[PDB]
């Protein structure tokens, strides 16, 4: 009984979301009708995690969307797994999403802000106990980035003591979809830092990158592009749903990996991928998972480590496994590269086991890390904002809605220091 | 009778505490569901007009671990009330599990506890199982012992608890929550004792042949350390060891107590007929550093007095030769003040062995508890570790948002330095 | 896959037909040269039949269809054969044919 | 007590927990013989993690026991045999047909009918009314809880039918009531409610 | 043995309770043609409370259909259910309503008075007992208005015992079909507050609000606006025709809700009302029902309660349902909101357990109070017809029926006291 309450967030967060359910959907086993016609009991066992059940054995799941235009939500009306949700869940509103995060922040946030409240508070007070909230949004989008930072403010208001675990989508370095991406992230940034417990970041380049060198897929879909990323969501929740030899929750995972408040931006990476041709040469053991998950090619945030130093680093793995050769790796993988760990800090892995894998897979395992590769990501988004911010006219469009431009400075002012925070601690 | 109250906190002490009662049921003869197809009071009590339930109290902070107990075969054994499960784990903290969440839960485990003991005419003490490195085992573990001691004083709590390995580790926060629980320990346990998985691991695999083990291997051997030591009080023998025998003769001095844990034989069937297993064979083996279930050499140290427990075919005779022999070793150093150093206890039930067992069926058998100024290095590993953190601070807001004054960390620091001024105050001879 | 042989020297070939998004290295399946059966005996138009399951180098395949001068040449040696068998249908392709099809089919 | 019985309930339970033994079994096996000792092979199967009965290890044992020694079992045979009950490995062979994804997935009716008269002219739903009993959502209670709850409706049946429907509707695996499909045939039989 | 004579006056009586003996014919399981086709025995235990029976096992309605005009008659009669009625219960003028309150009540009130009355006294000593009457009327026409409040004084005149439980329309201000229902309304206040024991007021603003938020219905017509009300009189008599656990008749309710003769106006609430395209998710428990009852949106009568402070409160369940679930609610839902209850009654939740539950609903639940917000109802008609008042509008139509123009100035006087009877105890 650790409820968790899942909120999407625009065009990224919907898509994301719809596939996210699949997985999940299928991992316990509902049918697309609302029905559970699974094949075990375990099963059952804690499905109230993220299913409430309606009379007539029909189980729907705690899951809000939210955007600002209305051609978002019907794809997934008529989607395959469309009918799981719950109709009043829906919220929407009637006005273009106009790729700015001040028209959203202020002008329609508002209004949408209060109809969404009462709609969390149905899902959020509807059950016996409730763990944290958790949220998938872009932010170089105009709706996730200005209305998904709104919402994560007053959600810590009314709520300060559940886990705020985010999933964000950076703007991409090289080629991206939006002019006026720098603003609205950099602008994000400063709402992320003070009041998200924990932030996953996560990159179409390297989504792009693993398709092509893993899986070998000619022409890789947005399908498979958020097939990867649901994989990375639904390890982490999975010592809650799953028994295991050593369980660990969120908060088990937060304390661990976050020495300071302000240091709890993390990279993420899943094993094994293989693919579709060499699944069959590809001997699967403990060892053989652990190689990829520190391998640089396997992060989907396009941040290489070995240009930084690690913090803290946490695994997780599924299935029936020996202990002591989890516990082996963890020790020669810290003792062989000893250069790219921090001195002050011993053991900087942590572990975990859950008992049952995935289907098909007969063992898996999900990398969650800290290191100051981030002042990379940060230095790329700073040094574009600083030539556009000179460029006084484009801020036209973010003043008419009302912001004051001395809000660029407070938001170029707060992640330069966050970028020397990471500096500093690198020593 | 004369029985024993068991408690088990943490994941670790109720996975333990599975394979303990596993190994109580099928040595007394005891089916799962508490009939029969003696000692029975000692760990059960007679109360389902065939039925027999365990003297036992399972408690965490969080349901999986207990509920796996409430589905599993063995679940129709214990009284409902004997079986509490919490709402959310400590989160590895030693501050949540002491003061916010702990608190929370204390005085409902207290009720039961004293419930049991009421039925129990003849306790004569308690057996206490923590992890070091979890929350609930060393936050809660401390708010429970503090409260134990208050409420009956004079009644024998002793402690097997799981030291963390000097290299493996599975949690980073691992030294904050050790030192914390080791001042409340310390003054509060009648005798603790250690154990840590890193050696179980060389040993599971080295003597007893096998190539991968899990947690499951390791908490059977546990079961078979803690039947040795209780099985003087259930069974027949010629030289019978109480509660009171092991303390009074193991501790010289209040704050030295904590002594190391060793069993032998441990060997395959594979092994086992080959070789004679004699009294003076096995009694050898277990002064090696190998066999030793913590991972830290006598040679470092020096010895204080000994106890050695025998079950089955032992006889009198052997256990004066083969100890006569040990005194002849020079690689065994023993201090001046203490020049008997012996207490041995011999007991006719043999070992019993497991459906899906891991050991072989041996005649004869021996484990011994012993004290020893080489445990000073596993406290000198902690000590350095913890200073690293703390020289930068790394953890603290975590610990401090929870409940805890920062005064607290330098205590605990203080009270272990004591601690080892206490081993090598003694260690010197005179 | 597709299976070419040579009237010429008796060399035969096979060739699997390139799919998008397989995720599998296409193209030459077996070079050209002499075959061998599992006999040690060097394969021949003779071994070639319309049904009939058709072993090489550890696999076995099935014959499923032949080409127009393939059935007459194969008519005037009265080796001609036509199967209701079908190839059974890949539940992968199914798969993702139908998420394609979600994406393209029908509001309407 | 049966070799058959036991290896498909071995089966099940790979299907279920999704577990393959030859990681675990060829561990021991130094000199790769497909033959390692009785005692490791019992010690193998603890550490797989199901519960094997002593009365299935003998009957085990005496099956795959070995002829070119004392009490060895061949663990590649037992292994090789339980993965078959998934997939022939001969598959580059054609013929044979994989499970796909779905092979791999009186008295008692006059106490019903009877039942269904309560609930029709009452107008019940019992789904909702035995939840008090079944914690962990496994959606199995004791019978006695399950008896309780009957008359707490109010239907204040002979002792020994209410017995018969628990002997019937009795869940194997847990030794309790199922009611899970007791609501399910209920409700069906009352009709439309 | 507790029958109840059925009164039904104007265009809104004829309508509403043609529909309401639908709903006791499904209930009860009665055929169009007038004969028992039923499933259960219940049925038959106390079907007297509604119906005779007439020689040949055909069962009519204690039903009095009273019009000034034979158009809405023939209406009822080619209704589906309209042969079910007895012939002579039909009444009926020969002259137009003509929306005039004097007219009504004095030119043909009086002529209509006499032949009706003979006719209730056939349903009223027909019956072993008789508990009380029930009457159904707008207060904003001419016919129901006026000939309803002749007909309720001659009504108390002969039987001062029984029940004389009203349910009556407020013409919606803003709103309402014609121009002079101000000054019908006020007219026929007076003679209600003296007369009737139970008032229970509907507005038909609040019946549209809730289909379009609550039902989504696009087109609501009148069928679902009657249908909607004919739940409410069908679960207030239900503890007479069904046994349960804690019954409660229409005695009972006047006894715990009125503590001064004159307080007696009530407003109705029903539960649960669910969207056809929602009903299948939504988990109907005990607790879900008393959120809706006491949410001030699904209140029929367009006051609301939050302005105002609740005296008395009663609640209504259906269905086989825990009796501990029932009490906890109210003493929960009696501490939380404490702001609105005087402190001078507690305990002001008043409830009761009924068995069968209507077709298709596992259980349901009924909710009638009593609260100051009623001073909001009287406000906007006072003003209303003050300012027809002031320039003397169209009295001229009411004098030449023979209406004094001081009956005006003492029927604005006693509801002036009303609304102060309502202020005083708000202390
Ligand atoms: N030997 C042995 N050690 C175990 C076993 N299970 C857990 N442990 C130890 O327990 C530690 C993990 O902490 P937990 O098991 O969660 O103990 P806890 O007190 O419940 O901690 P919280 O979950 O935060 O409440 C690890 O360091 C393991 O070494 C076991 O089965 N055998
Ligand atoms: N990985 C991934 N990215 C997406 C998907 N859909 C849209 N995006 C990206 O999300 C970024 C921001 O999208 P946008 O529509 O502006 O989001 P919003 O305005 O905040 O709701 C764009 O650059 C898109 O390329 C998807 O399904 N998967
Ligand atoms: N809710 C509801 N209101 C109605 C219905 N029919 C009429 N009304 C309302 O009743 C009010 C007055 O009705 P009226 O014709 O004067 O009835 P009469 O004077 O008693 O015969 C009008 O404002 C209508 O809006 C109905 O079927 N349902
Ligand atoms: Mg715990």
């Not at chain 1, 209060?114 to 872009?138: M, N, P, T, W, Y």
């Not at chain 4, 004791?142 to 628990?166: M, V």
């Amino acid at each position: 009984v650790r409820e968790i309450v899942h909120i999407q967030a625009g065009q990224c967060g919907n898509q994301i979301g719809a596939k996210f359910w699949e997985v999940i959907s299928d991992e316990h086993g509902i049918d697309p009708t609302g029905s559970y016609h699974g094949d075990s009991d375990l099963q059952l066992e804690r499905i109230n995690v993220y299913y409430n059940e309606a009379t007539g054995g029909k189980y729907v799941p705690r899951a809000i969307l939210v955007d600002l235009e209305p051609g978002t939500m019907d794809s997934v009306r008529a989607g395959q797994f469309g009918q799981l949700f719950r109709p009043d869940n829906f919220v929407f509103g009637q006005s273009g999403a106009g790729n700015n995060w001040a028209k959203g922040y202020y002008t329609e946030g508002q209004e949408l802000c209060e109809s969404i409240l009462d709609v969390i508070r149905k899902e959020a007070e509807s059950c016996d106990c409730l763990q944290g909230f958790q949220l998938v949004h872009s932010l170089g989008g105009g709706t996730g980035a200005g209305l998904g930072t709104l919402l994560l403010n007053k959600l810590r208001e009314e709520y300060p003591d559940r886990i705020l675990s985010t999933y964000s989508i950076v703007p991409s370095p090289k080629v991206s979809d939006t002019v006026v991406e720098p603003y609205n992230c950099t602008l994000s940034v400063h709402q992320l830092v003070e009041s998200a417990d924990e932030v996953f970041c996560i990159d179409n380049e390297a989504l792009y990158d693993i398709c092509f060198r893993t899986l070998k897929l000619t022409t890789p879909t947005y399908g498979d592009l958020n097939h990867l990323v649901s994989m990375v969501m639904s390890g982490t929740t999975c010592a809650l749903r799953f028994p295991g030899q050593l369980n660990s929750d969120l908060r088990k995972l937060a304390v661990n990996l976050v020495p300071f408040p302000r240091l709890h931006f993390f990279i993420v990476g899943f094993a094994p991928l293989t693919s579709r041709g060499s699944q069959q040469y590809r001997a699967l053991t403990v060892p053989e998972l652990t190689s990829q998950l520190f391998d640089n090619k396997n992060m989907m945030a396009a941040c290489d480590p070995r240009r930084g130093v690690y913090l803290t680093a946490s695994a997780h793995f599924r299935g029936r496994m020996s202990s002591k050769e989890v516990d082996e790796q963890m020790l020669n993988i810290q003792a062989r590269n000893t250069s790219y760990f921090v001195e002050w800090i011993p053991s900087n892995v942590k572990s975990a086991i859950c008992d049952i894998p995935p289907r098909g897979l007969k063992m898996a395992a999900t990398f969650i890390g800290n290191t100051t590769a981030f002042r990379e990501l940060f230095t790329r988004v700073d040094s574009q904002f600083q030539k556009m911010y000179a460029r006084r006219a484009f801020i036209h469009w973010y003043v008419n809605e009302g912001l004051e431009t001395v809000e660029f400075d407070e938001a170029r002012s707060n992640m330069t220091d966050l970028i020397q925070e990471y500096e500093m601690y690198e020593t | 009778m004369r029985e024993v109250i068991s408690i088990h906190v943490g994941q670790a002490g109720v996975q333990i505490g599975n394979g303990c009662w596993e190994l109580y049921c099928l040595e007394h003869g005891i089916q799962p569901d508490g009939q029969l197809p003696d000692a029975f009071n000692t760990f059960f009590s007679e109360t389902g007009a065939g039925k027999h339930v365990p003297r036992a109290v399972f408690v965490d902070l969080e349901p999986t671990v207990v509920d796996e107990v409430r589905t599993g075969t063995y679940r129709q054994l214990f009284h409902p009330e004997q079986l509490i499960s919490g709402k959310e784990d400590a989160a590895n903290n030693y501050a949540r599990g002491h003061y916010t969440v702990g608190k929370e839960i204390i005085d409902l485990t207290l009720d039961r506890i004293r419930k049991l003991a009421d039925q129990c005419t003849g306790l004569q003490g308690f057996l206490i199982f923590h992890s070091f490195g979890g929350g609930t085992g060393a936050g809660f573990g401390s708010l429970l012992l503090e409260r134990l001691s208050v409420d009956y004083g004079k009644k024998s709590k002793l402690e097997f608890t799981v030291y963390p390995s000097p290299q493996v580790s599975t949690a980073i926060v691992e030294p904050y929550n050790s030192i914390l629980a080791t001042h409340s320990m310390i003054d509060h346990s009648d005798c603790a004792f250690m154990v840590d998985n890193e050696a179980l691991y060389d040993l599971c695999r080295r003597a007893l042949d096998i190539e991968r083990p899990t947690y499951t291997n390791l908490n059977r051997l546990i079961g078979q350390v803690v039947s040795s030591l209780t099985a003087s009080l259930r069974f027949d023998g010629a030289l019978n060891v109480d509660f009171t025998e092991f303390q009074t003769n193991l501790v010289p001095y209040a704050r030295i107590h904590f002594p190391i844990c060793s069993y032998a034989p441990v060997i395959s069937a594979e092994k086992a007929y080959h070789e004679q297993l004699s009294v003076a064979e096995i009694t050898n083996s277990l002064f090696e550093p190998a066999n030793m279930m913590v991972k830290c050499d006598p040679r470092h140290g020096k010895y204080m007095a000994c106890t050695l427990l025998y079950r089955g075919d032992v006889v009198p005779k052997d256990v004066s030769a083969a100890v006569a022999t040990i005194k002849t070793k020079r690689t065994i150093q023993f201090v001046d003040w203490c020049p008997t150093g012996f207490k041995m206890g011999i007991n006719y039930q043999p070992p019993t062995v497991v459906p899906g067992g891991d050991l072989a069926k041996v005649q004869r058998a021996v484990c011994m508890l012993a004290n020893t100024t080489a445990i000073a290095e596993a406290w000198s590993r902690l000590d350095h570790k913890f200073d690293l953190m703390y020289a930068k601070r790394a953890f603290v807001h975590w610990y401090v948002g929870e409940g805890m004054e920062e005064a607290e960390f330098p205590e605990a620091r203080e009270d272990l330095a004591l601690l080892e001024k206490d081993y090598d105050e003694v260690a010197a001879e005179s | 896959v597709k299976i070419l042989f040579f009237l010429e020297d008796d060399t035969i070939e096979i060739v699997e037909p390139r799919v998008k998004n397989s995720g599998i290295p296409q193209g030459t399946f077996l070079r050209r040269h002499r075959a061998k059966k599992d006999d040690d005996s060097y394969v021949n138009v003779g071994d070639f039949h319309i049904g009939e399951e058709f072993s090489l180098y550890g696999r076995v395949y099935f014959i499923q269809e032949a080409d127009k001068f393939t059935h007459e040449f194969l008519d005037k040696l009265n080796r001609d054969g036509r199967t209701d068998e079908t190839i059974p249908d890949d539940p992968y392709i199914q798969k993702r044919t139908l998420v394609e099809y979600n994406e393209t089919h029908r509001n309407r | 007590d049966n070799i058959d019985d036991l290896l498909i309930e071995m089966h099940k339970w790979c299907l279920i927990n999704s577990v393959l033994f030859a990681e675990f079994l060829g561990q021991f096996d130094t000199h790769n013989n497909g033959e390692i000792t009785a005692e490791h092979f019992r010690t193998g199967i603890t550490i797989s993690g199901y519960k094997l009965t002593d009365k299935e290890f003998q009957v085990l044992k005496d099956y795959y026991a070995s002829e070119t020694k004392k009490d060895y079992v061949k663990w590649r045979q037992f292994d090789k045999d339980v993965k078959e009950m998934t997939v022939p490995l001969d598959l580059e062979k054609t013929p044979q047909f994989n499970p796909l994804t779905q092979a791999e997935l009186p008295k008692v009716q006059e106490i019903v009918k009877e039942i269904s008269k309560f609930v029709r002219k009452r107008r019940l739903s019992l789904i909702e009314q035995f939840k008090d009993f079944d914690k962990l959502n496994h959606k199995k209670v004791n019978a006695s809880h399950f008896t309780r709850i009957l008359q707490l409706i109010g239907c204040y049946l002979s002792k020994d039918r209410i017995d018969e429907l628990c002997s019937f509707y009795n869940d194997p695996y847990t030794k309790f009531v199922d009611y899970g499909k007791f609501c399910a045939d209920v409700d069906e039989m009352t009709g439309q409610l």
